[PDB]
RNA sequence: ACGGAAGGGCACCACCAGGAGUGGAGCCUGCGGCUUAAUUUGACUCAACACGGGGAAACUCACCAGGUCCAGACACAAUAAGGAUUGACAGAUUGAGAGCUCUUUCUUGAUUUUGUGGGUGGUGGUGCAUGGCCGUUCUUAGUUGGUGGAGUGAUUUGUCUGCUUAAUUGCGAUAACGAACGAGACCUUAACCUACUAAAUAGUGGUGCUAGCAUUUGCUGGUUAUCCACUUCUUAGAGGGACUAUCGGUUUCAAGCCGAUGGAAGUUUGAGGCAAUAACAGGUCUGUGAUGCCCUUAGACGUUCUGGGCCGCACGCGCGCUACACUGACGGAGCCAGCGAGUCUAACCUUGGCCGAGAGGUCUUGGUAAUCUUGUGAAACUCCGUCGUGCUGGGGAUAGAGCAUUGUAAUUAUUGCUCUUCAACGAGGAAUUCCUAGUAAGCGCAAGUCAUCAGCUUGCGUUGAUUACGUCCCUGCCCUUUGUACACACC
């Protein structure tokens, strides 16, 4: 199967900074972006348009770094450079609670399962975790840089013993918290240079972190090992991973790159084409995320557009 | 041929409004399931618009496939309605 | 519903025959090369393969929704519940429909027989592909009936 | 097959073609008002606008297909 | 004209017929397919029938 | 809860089998009782033609087969879990139908 | 290429040794001939003749005797809103409730009518103008580049003395080296798995309830999920297993071959599918809205409707079915499979209850199907009895009377059932077909065609052999050598 054009999505006046999906409705497509606003989508499965926008989310000062949809595809998230957070619904914009207590940009913010409390990876080399009132209910250190991103763990079984999350900073090594005790658990180290992003499959066992340097190397938190490390050769920006089937996709700086992990090999280098732009350097995906039914991939581009990637 | 007047509007209105046409090759069909009159009557009249132009036919499986043309909605609205109607699916 | 699974599959297959036997004779001069039929619940889609999808896609996306259309009056199909898409060929060098019709549309320009031929299956392995052969068959410049071949690389039949 | 006998008498007849009368719409003129002669119909879907054909002691009426038959 | 199609086709070769060549001979009426059998071997492998053994 | 069933008939056993593992696969990632895949005896359907056109020649027949494959899963779920497992595994070649009871 | 030339091999479409037969009889089914208004037609050695999926009552249908309709689009010209034209009650007429056509006078009205061009259709012709498909050469192992060598050249070598193989399969030898297609490999199916993956749409054991005997704790059952457990049997996913393994014997000591053991399986494990280069004036224009050229195109070679014909019988031929009986016929009894098919806007597979000798009729039910038909309780087979060497009670041809089913329609009997009629045929001349192990042969069953009809075909299972493990004698095929006045190639 080959991923291959479908349309593009125009409505930012800057990067795209965060793609997110809901599995409540298919067509919902939360996105991110550099000029201070979040764009709420709705897809019809058609040509080169793909649909249009449905709700526009303003009230930010900064640049919103990252956007997030929780399971019912009402409620979503945004981790904003404005040193808040903000929660709002695709229904009416309407931010229901701020959340306010860092001291510098805040990268990413993750919901937990059954929107039960919210965690959020800083600049402050902290990483807080919110209650929905507003209330910070707990405050965790021990990052010596300031972290690039965080995220939780889709726990496999429906909530079997406890929730866990994980954290990527600039100090090339990845911490593991177990919220329910505010205590860590693993180090992870190896990367030579910043991280960047990292993500978890939705297995709930592989973590994939990636940096500067280019390299994706893989962990299972579950057995606390590193099995590889295979190389993109460019700079990488952001990576995920396919909820359906065994693929892992990386927002490289020459491009995207899917990858096949079961028996690692590349797929197909996809390089769309941008009329122009030949001199400086040539558009990049800067964020991605894989769709509910994994057979569509959005990446946001840097020249103001959401692209679409679907399987045949 | 016959083709009676009142039974010639439905037919070009169909064409018209949709200017898709199937219309089942199978004469004496005892009345055709879109267009409530007879289905010689459909084939005949939409086969007397395309001799001299005004929609492309193509045949297969015992099917027609009536398509309207350019050339057949200007001459179709005069015959039919008033301007600034869309035929086909041209309309978004 | 309620149709036995037997003569269910007999039906979306003969449903592929006679879409496929329309789409070459509809769009024999697009490069028409194939279809695939996604059988789906909540409007389930049809994948067009056609090396030139800007004349597939038609002005102001025309050219179609007459196919749609079409294929929604003759099937009879709810309203809505189809629709069709068009992404062009992978190696349309590789493929013998589109190579095929290629032979047949130099041919009908007024091509020498020879000319044409060759022509094509260089073009084939120029494509990467390992063997490539041409037949022509008919009464190509005499009244008695001939049959001259083309091949390149080389073929296998096991 | 070679060719026809037409053992068939030589019969290259055709319908009547319509007879072509004169005109044919007298209902009648006195010096000017108009009785109606040439009565109509009893349908209901006839609203008094077709003349009943009188041929021997018959009354037909072309509007109907077949049969409008009020015999007097 | 009430003669011109007065007799019955509810059975027999005339009722059926082929729906790509339009024949009525040789007809393969197997699972609903009531199609030629020439027809058929032209586009069996499109319907799905492959030959193994 | 309600306990339904989930029947999956195909041409294709490439095309199912993953798919049925994949049915159950997102079956005991949380827990419940499976009562999983059970297939069917295979379908094959034959057509004997004789060969040929018009009856020249050494009396030479066909035989083409379709092969038609079944399985069956029944389980038991909350509706609003019965609902997102059969929109996300679609795939070609296979029909997939849910009896409610 | 051929040889009534030689050498080496191979083949139950060849023989050997046999088996079952066919050719002899009745029948039914194609072909010819005859006949006919028509008995439509293609195909004539293999490679025409139960073939055209061709088991035709109408339809199919192309043939014959008749009756309709334009579904002749469009362009031009002419008639023509003082009417271009269509339809029709009743009667005549007609096979006919065809306004066919006529008598009469109503209706419709600008789409039609006529003429000029064209259009369209044709199961009209040409398969010796063609495409595609198939058959055959051809159940065989053959075929071709590149570079180099030989020859003035057509051509040749490679592609071969020998041995081996099912194989131009290999060991090898070598003016050749390195390749490609074919073969093989491959794919499907049938065999083995107490190993995995688990099945109330497959089973098994126990547990509850309950029946019959024995009674002593047992046997045979039933119980739609009462419940529990498992996958041996059944299913289907991924796999494993055979590669001639081991040993012995033979050869140039190799490719291989033979014998024995083990193994589910030792012939390429069995059977298929697929399948080279070149070719045929092979078949198909009657599969196609595949098609060139010629013909026809309105009283039509179009199309439709009513009847008939394809089936007609002094005779000849091919494929078959039933028999000539005791290894059997008939009547009860036992009861044993596999491949498959089956109906939503339509009557498909039909269980069960009732009526009827039977055919069948009626009221319901299950099934869109590992669920129900269905354990398809099939037939040959096996016991017990009658028959008693007799064209007999073998055989059921031909024919008469009646009862039912499908169909608009059953006469030229559609077919099924009941009673009666009781022919030839006493193991088949010359010739001739097929076949080597779950094979021939015997036996029935499902599917195709179907509305009704199977003595036909495609598959399936039941019972299950005798004879060979070879040869080139007959008929053919592959290679080499050889002769040739043959090249349309020994017809
Ligand atoms: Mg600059």
Redesign the pocket.
Same mark, same amino acid.
């Given at each position: 199967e080959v991923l291959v054009l479908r349309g593009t999505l125009e409505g930012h006046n800057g990067w795209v900074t965060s793609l997110a999906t809901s599995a409540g409705q298919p067509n919902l497509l939360l996105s991110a972006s550099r000029d201070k606003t979040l764009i709420s989508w709705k897809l019809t499965g058609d040509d080169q348009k793909f649909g249009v926008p449905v709700r526009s989310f303003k009230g930010h000062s900064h640049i919103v770094q990252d956007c997030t949809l929780t399971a019912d595809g009402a409620y979503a998230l945004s981790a904003s450079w404005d040193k808040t957070l903000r929660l709002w619904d695709v229904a009416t914009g309407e931010t229901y609670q701020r959340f306010v207590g860092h001291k510098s940009d805040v990268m990413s913010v993750d919901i937990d399962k059954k929107a039960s409390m919210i965690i959020s990876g800083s600049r402050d080399k902290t990483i807080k975790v919110w209650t929905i009132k507003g209330q910070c209910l707990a405050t965790l250190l021990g990052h010596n840089d300031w972290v690039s991103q965080v995220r939780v763990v889709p726990n496999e079984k429906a909530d079997d013993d406890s929730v866990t999350i994980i954290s990527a900073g600039n100090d090339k090594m990845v911490k593991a918290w177990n919220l329910n005790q505010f205590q860590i658990e693993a180090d992870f180290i190896g990367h030579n240079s910043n991280i960047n992003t990292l993500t978890a499959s939705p297995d709930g066992t592989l973590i994939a972190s990636a940096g500067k340097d280019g390299e994706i190397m893989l962990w299972n938190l579950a057995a606390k090992k590193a099995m590889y490390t295979l190389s993109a050769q460019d700079e990488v920006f952001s990576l995920a991973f396919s909820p359906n089937r065994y693929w892992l996709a990386a927002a490289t700086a020459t491009g995207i790159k899917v990858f096949s992990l079961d028996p690692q090999y590349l797929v197909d280098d996809l390089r769309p084409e941008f009329a122009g732009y030949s001199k400086a350097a040539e558009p990049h995906a800067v964020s991605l995320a894989w769709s509910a039914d994994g057979q569509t991939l959005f990446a946001g581009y840097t020249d103001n557009v959401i692209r679409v990637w679907q399987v045949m | 041929?016959?083709?009676? %007047?009142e039974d010639?509007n439905k037919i070009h209105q169909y064409l018209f409004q949709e200017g898709v046409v199937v219309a089942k %090759?199978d004469?004496?069909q005892a009345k055709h399931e879109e267009i409530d009159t007879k289905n010689?009557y459909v084939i %005949?009249a939409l086969?007397?618009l395309?001799? %001299?132009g005004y929609v492309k036919?193509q045949?297969?499986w015992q099917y027609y496939y009536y398509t309207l043309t350019e050339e057949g909605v200007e001459y179709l609205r005069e015959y039919l309605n008033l301007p600034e109607h869309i035929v086909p699916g041209t309309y978004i | 519903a309620?149709?036995?699974?037997?003569?269910?599959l007999v039906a979306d297959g003969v449903f592929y025959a006679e879409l496929n036997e329309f789409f070459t004779r509809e769009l024999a001069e697009e490069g028409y090369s194939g279809v695939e039929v996604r059988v789906t619940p909540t409007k389930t889609e049809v994948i067009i393969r056609a090396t030139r999808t800007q004349d597939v896609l038609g002005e102001n996306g025309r050219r179609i929704n007459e196919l749609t259309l079409l294929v929604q009056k003759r099937f009879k199909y709810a309203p809505g519940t189809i629709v069709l898409y068009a992404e062009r060929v992978q190696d349309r060098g590789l493929s013998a429909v589109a190579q095929a019709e290629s032979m047949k549309f130099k041919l009908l320009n007024g091509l020498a027989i020879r000319r044409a031929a060759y022509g094509v299956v260089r073009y084939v392995m120029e494509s990467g592909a390992k063997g490539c052969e041409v037949?022509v068959?008919?009464?190509l410049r005499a009244?008695?009936?001939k049959?001259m071949?083309f091949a390149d690389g080389?073929?296998?039949?096991? | 097959?070679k060719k026809? $006998?037409?053992?068939?008498?030589?019969?290259?007849?055709?319908?009547?073609?319509?007879?072509?009368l004169? $005109?044919?719409s007298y209902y009648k003129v006195d010096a000017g008002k108009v009785t109606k002669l040439?009565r109509e119909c009893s349908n209901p879907t006839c609203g008094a606008?077709?003349?009943?054909?009188?041929?021997?002691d018959?009354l037909?009426?072309?509007?109907?297909?077949? $049969?409008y038959?009020v015999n007097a | 004209?009430?003669?011109?199609? =007065?007799?019955?086709?509810?059975?027999?070769?005339? =009722? *059926?017929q082929?729906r790509? #060549?339009? =024949?009525?001979?040789?007809?393969?009426?197997?699972?609903?397919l009531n199609i030629? *059998?020439? #027809?058929? *071997?032209?586009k069996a492998n499109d319907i799905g029938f492959n030959?193994?053994? | 809860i309600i306990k339904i069933r989930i029947?999956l008939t195909s041409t294709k !056993?490439?095309q199912? &089998?993953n798919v049925s593992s994949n049915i159950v696969k997102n079956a005991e990632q949380h827990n419940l009782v499976?009562?999983?895949? !059970?297939?069917?005896?295979?379908? !094959?359907?034959?057509? @004997?033609?004789?060969?040929?056109?018009?009856? &020249?020649? @050494?009396?030479?027949?066909?035989?083409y &087969?379709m092969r038609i494959?079944?399985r069956?899963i029944?389980l038991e779920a909350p509706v609003q879990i019965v609902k997102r497992i059969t929109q996300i595994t679609i795939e070609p070649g296979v029909d997939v139908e849910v009896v409610v009871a």
């Open positions: - | 041929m016959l083709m009676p %007047k010639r %090759k004469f004496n010689l %005949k086969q007397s395309t001799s %001299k036919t045949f297969s | 309620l149709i036995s699974k037997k003569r269910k037949v068959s008919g009464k009244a008695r009936a049959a071949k080389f073929l296998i039949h096991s | 097959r026809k $006998v037409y053992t068939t008498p030589k019969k290259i007849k055709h319908k009547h073609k319509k007879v072509k004169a $005109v044919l040439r606008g077709v003349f009943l054909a009188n041929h021997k018959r037909y009426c072309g509007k109907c297909h077949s $049969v038959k | 004209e009430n003669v011109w199609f =007065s007799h019955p086709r509810r059975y027999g070769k005339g =009722s *059926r082929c790509v #060549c339009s =024949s009525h001979t040789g007809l393969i009426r197997k699972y609903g030629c *059998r020439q #027809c058929f *071997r032209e030959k193994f053994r | 029947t !056993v490439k199912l &089998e499976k009562k999983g895949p !059970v297939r069917l005896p295979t379908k !094959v359907l034959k057509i @004997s033609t004789r060969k040929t056109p018009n009856g &020249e020649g @050494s009396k030479t027949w066909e035989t &087969e494959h079944k069956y029944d």
